[PDB]
Paper text:
Overexpression of NAMPT has been observed in different cancer types and has been implicated to confer resistance to classic chemotherapeutics, whereas inhibition sensitizes cancer cells to oxidative stress and DNA-damaging agents. Thus, inhibition of NAD+ biosynthesis facilitated by NAMPT shows potential as an anticancer therapy. KPT-9274 represents a new class of NAMPT inhibitors and shows promising pharmacokinetics (Karyopharm Therapeutics). Using the CRISPRres approach, we revealed NAMPT as the key cellular target of the clinical inhibitor KPT-9274 by showing that mutations in NAMPT confer resistance to KPT-9274.
Crystallographic analysis of the binding mode revealed that two KPT-9274 molecules are bound to the NAMPT dimer. The binding mode is largely similar to that of FK866. In more detail, the amino-pyridinyl of KPT-9274 is coordinated via pi-stacking interactions between tyrosine 18 and phenylalanine 193. Furthermore, the amide linker is well coordinated via hydrogen-bonding interactions and the free electron pairs of the amide oxygen are stabilized by a hydrogen bond originating from serine 275. The nitrogen forms a hydrogen bond with a water molecule that further interacts with the carboxyl group of aspartate 219 and the hydroxyl group of serine 241. At the solvent exposed regions of the binding site, the chemical composition of KPT-9274 and the interactions with the NAMPT protein are different from FK866. KPT-9274 is branched and binds to two different solvent exposed patches whereas FK866 only occupies a single hydrophobic site. The first hydrophobic patch outlined by the hydrophobic sidechains of isoleucine 309, isoleucine 351, and alanine 379 is occupied by the aromatic fluorophenyl group of KPT-9274. The second solvent exposed binding site, which is only covered by KPT-9274, consists of tyrosine 188 and tyrosine 240 that interact with the difluoro-1-piperidinyl carbonyl phenyl group via Van der Waals interactions and a hydrogen bond between the carbonyl group and the amino group of lysine 216. Deletion of G383 causes a conformational change of the G383–385 stretch, which destablizes the conformation of F193 and thereby prevents pi-stacking with the ligand.
Author numbering:
A (entry chain B), B (entry chain A): 8 to 42, 53 to 483
The structure:
């Protein structure tokens, strides 16, 4: 079973011997520090509160096991068995901590307070920063949900220019990242952060996470359609690629189907196999069940353009009201190789220069969507800003001489709306002056109980585009 | 509870209707595809065999739950209920699969087969590639262990040159990445892969993973020392940084202690606080308990060089047998900000240029060691290379015209030793000719059971440097 006594940075085990004596309160905050990515989607804290922090988390056996492990780890006795036994006997193992956050789904500019942590018992001054390590890991669902939303902005801009509406926007980016992430638990959390902005996912693990910790009115938050891989094509033999194509579109003639076509020669497959030999099985398909050709190699922009030119000469093309070319409704294209936020912008801009509408194409991303992200992308940081010693409170901060970008905020913090409708974080307890309205932070956790929750439905609504 | 029926890519559920009819065998393999990082460390397979693949993995309840989820996910009933009911009734929920693999810890050049997967029942031809997604995730411990070993190579070269031996090598790179990874399960896997090469870690979760799935002779595989953070220094007050230093070094006066010193001015704390105000508490410390000064901001190379020049003028410096300068044995330095494999080489080369020995310094890394890594750094890939249909086996392969590097191998594979002592992978069953000796892969999994395993002590021995 999970042991919260073994889920911290090793060195923090010794921090109860370094704080100033006669200290009764430690107050810390989380932010996406200022330095692209000017606003962040706050999401994922609710998952950590329920799975790791709520309820009875301390037992006599868990204290004894931490004592045994840390004895050999440090080659010394340094564990705070006395402090952890006080929580067990007085609060039945419930953590005496209060956490205030911003509602999940909110879009907030860089450099503002997103949540605060503090202890509610003077004896547990050391407990505030013990749970820093587990809490800081919220940088991952924040960054996945932000980076996915910024890719939605690019897609929405070019779809509106070339078509005149946003029909089908919310399944133009499919999640191919299950096998490209570092673990099973990461796959579930990352695919859920992507479903805040889109609807298509191949990463099954994200569905069960949402229903267990968030919930939705619909049966499932994500959907998929049948598709082929290189094994189900090459298994027929090099000389029988056309046999594998005919068989697969016939088994799935009533639903959409994606077919990877670059096993040997992608341009041969589009012009000769799809566009001639099997053309009669494509033009008869329904608008609700098109064929989706999938290239998978080469230069991403050059391959998409050459593919569209080949298909345009073999199938009837129309011109929409904005002047851009459009394929017949029974034929589309999906590009799912080498796709990140940078390449996605290069592709749609190139398609627009060649007078091709964004209606024709959708995208898929694997490692770029779920794995190629770090904690310094948005500079997520956790720092102490207020302590009480000998009954008097002081403001605490850091300010390295060689880097003013690492300066931290001072005192008790609060988040408010500006008169022009923006955000501002007030320091040194100045929010008590009541000049900026109501603090937008809400108590989500106190003394081992989750005091306020949000559904996955409200979160999607909070993260909408303008 | 984990359900293997929900731990695959969505599309793989629709693959049992796409293979050629009368197919009784699907045979697939894993490689680090060829085109820095010329050889890879194979580690991580055993963890996945025990936690997810062995034993009764199919029940009547798990079949019904996967059925219910897929009807909403696909808006159809494509799920293969009949295939999974046969495995339950015929094999008591045990997977009829055989896996062969190279011994864990082995160092193998790029472009060689590392493990193979095939079905042992003709009815379960679809099972081989169903477990591709879970097995491909072994890319992460392989890449962490490889990138960590390459960093050990750089440190060994410059330590031997500036000092004359390798004393202290196994803890010159400490793992700081607990808070910087994407989940709790990722932290345990990645820290365990780092301990293959080094012995210092702050990510506690790696210790329990090793003892449960690999085992070691000693009580624990990793160690740590007491250290400060920014909250335990700045909580004393801006004008009281000296008081915090004196307290911390007195509480830990008999063991090594690391003290972050860049809260306000790193260069002032080195020259005036450590080098003047508190110098009498440093020169009295034991060689087994030095003070370790830790900078944490600015340019990594420029800061380290200036910190060394300051201390060299406040403390007695000697010259070792190779001519390089050395601090007194009670004074060391650790640099744990912005360290990856690129900057680690720049720092160590610049230290040598200024005649400073590598004995004076250690390093720590967080996001660069455990998070800033993807699946295409080593080109880890899983592909089918052999099937049997109508009783006749054929060689299958992919070969895209726009990317010769994506070409895969054909037929039954085997790994052998060359007469000069190198590795070669034989294709198309040519290993049966017995011209290259015996196959180096070993059956590690068969019909639901682990058939061969390795201890963490054997893995470390196999992964040693030349
Ligand atoms: N490692 C890997 C893993 C996988 C792969 C290759 C995967 C692949 O090719 N996927 C194709 C694909 C999925 C998909 C899902 C949707 C989709 C998403 C959401 C909804 C939805 O909101 N609802 C459906 C259910 C409902 F009830 F109807 C109301 C709500 C519907 C469909 C749409 C298209 C599509 C793409 C391009 C097109 F042109 C057309 C469709 C889709 O295309 C490669 N490597
Ligand atoms: N998010 C985070 C997390 C942490 C931080 C800052 C952390 C910090 O400052 N850590 C200091 C530190 C630990 C440490 C461990 C060892 C160590 C590791 C392994 C062994 C070992 O091999 N064994 C244990 C004992 C044994 F019994 F022999 C068997 C084997 C011994 C020591 C050595 C030094 C050191 C650093 C610099 C020096 F100059 C010298 C030492 C060490 O220094 C920042 N952000």
């Amino acid at each position: 079973e999970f042991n919260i006594l073994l889920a911290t940075d090793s060195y923090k085990v010794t921090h109860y011997k370094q704080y100033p004596p006669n200290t009764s309160k430690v107050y810390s905050y989380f932010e996406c520090r200022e330095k692209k990515y000017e606003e962040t989607v706050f999401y994922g804290l609710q998952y950590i509160l329920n799975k790791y922090l709520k309820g009875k988390v301390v037992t006599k056996e868990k204290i004894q096991e931490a004592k045994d492990v840390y004895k050999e780890h440090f080659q010394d006795d340094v564990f705070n068995e006395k402090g952890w036994n006080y929580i067990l006997e007085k609060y039945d193992g419930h953590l005496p901590i209060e956490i205030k956050a911003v509602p999940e789904g909110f879009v907030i500019p860089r450099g503002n307070v997103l949540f605060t942590v503090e202890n509610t018992d003077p004896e547990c001054y050391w407990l505030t920063n013990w749970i820093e390590t587990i809490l800081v890991q919220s940088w991952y669902p924040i960054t996945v949900a932000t980076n996915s939303r910024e890719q939605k902005k690019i897609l929405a801009k070019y779809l509106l220019e070339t078509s005149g509406n946003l029909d089908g926007l919310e399944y133009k980016l499919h999640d191919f990242g299950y096998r490209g992430v570092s673990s099973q638990e990461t796959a579930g959390i990352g695919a859920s952060a992507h479903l805040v902005n889109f609807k298509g996912t191949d990463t099954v693990a994200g569905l069960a996470l949402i229903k267990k910790y968030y919930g939705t009115k619909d049966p499932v938050p994500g959907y998929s359609v049948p598709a082929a891989e290189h094994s189900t094509i090459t298994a027929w033999g090099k000389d029988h690629e056309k046999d594998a194509f005919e068989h697969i579109v016939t088994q799935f003639s009533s639903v959409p189907v994606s077919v990877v076509s670059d096993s040997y020669d992608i341009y041969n497959a589009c012009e000769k196999i799809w566009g001639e030999d099997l053309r009669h099985l494509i033009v008869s398909r329904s608008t609700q069940a098109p064929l989706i050709i999938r290239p998978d190699s080469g230069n991403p922009l050059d391959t998409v353009l050459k593919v569209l030119e080949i298909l345009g000469k073999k199938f009837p093309v129309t011109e929409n009201s904005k002047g851009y070319k459009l394929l017949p409704p029974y034929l589309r294209v999906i590009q799912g190789d080498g796709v990140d936020i940078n390449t996605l912008q290069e592709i749609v801009e190139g398609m627009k220069q060649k007078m091709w509408s964004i209606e024709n194409i959708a995208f898929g991303s694997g490692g770029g969507l779920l794995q190629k992200l770090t904690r310094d992308l948005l500079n997520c940081s956790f720092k102490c800003s207020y302590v009480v010693t000998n009954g008097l409170g002081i403001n605490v901060f850091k300010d390295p001489v060689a880097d003013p970008n690492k300066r931290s905020k001072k005192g008790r913090l609060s988040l408010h709306r500006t008169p022009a409708g923006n955000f501002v974080t007030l320091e040194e307890g100045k929010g008590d002056l009541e000049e900026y309205g109501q603090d937008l932070l809400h108590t989500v956790f106190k003394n081992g109980k989750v005091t306020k929750s949000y559904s996955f439905d409200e979160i999607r609504k909070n993260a909408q585009l303008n």
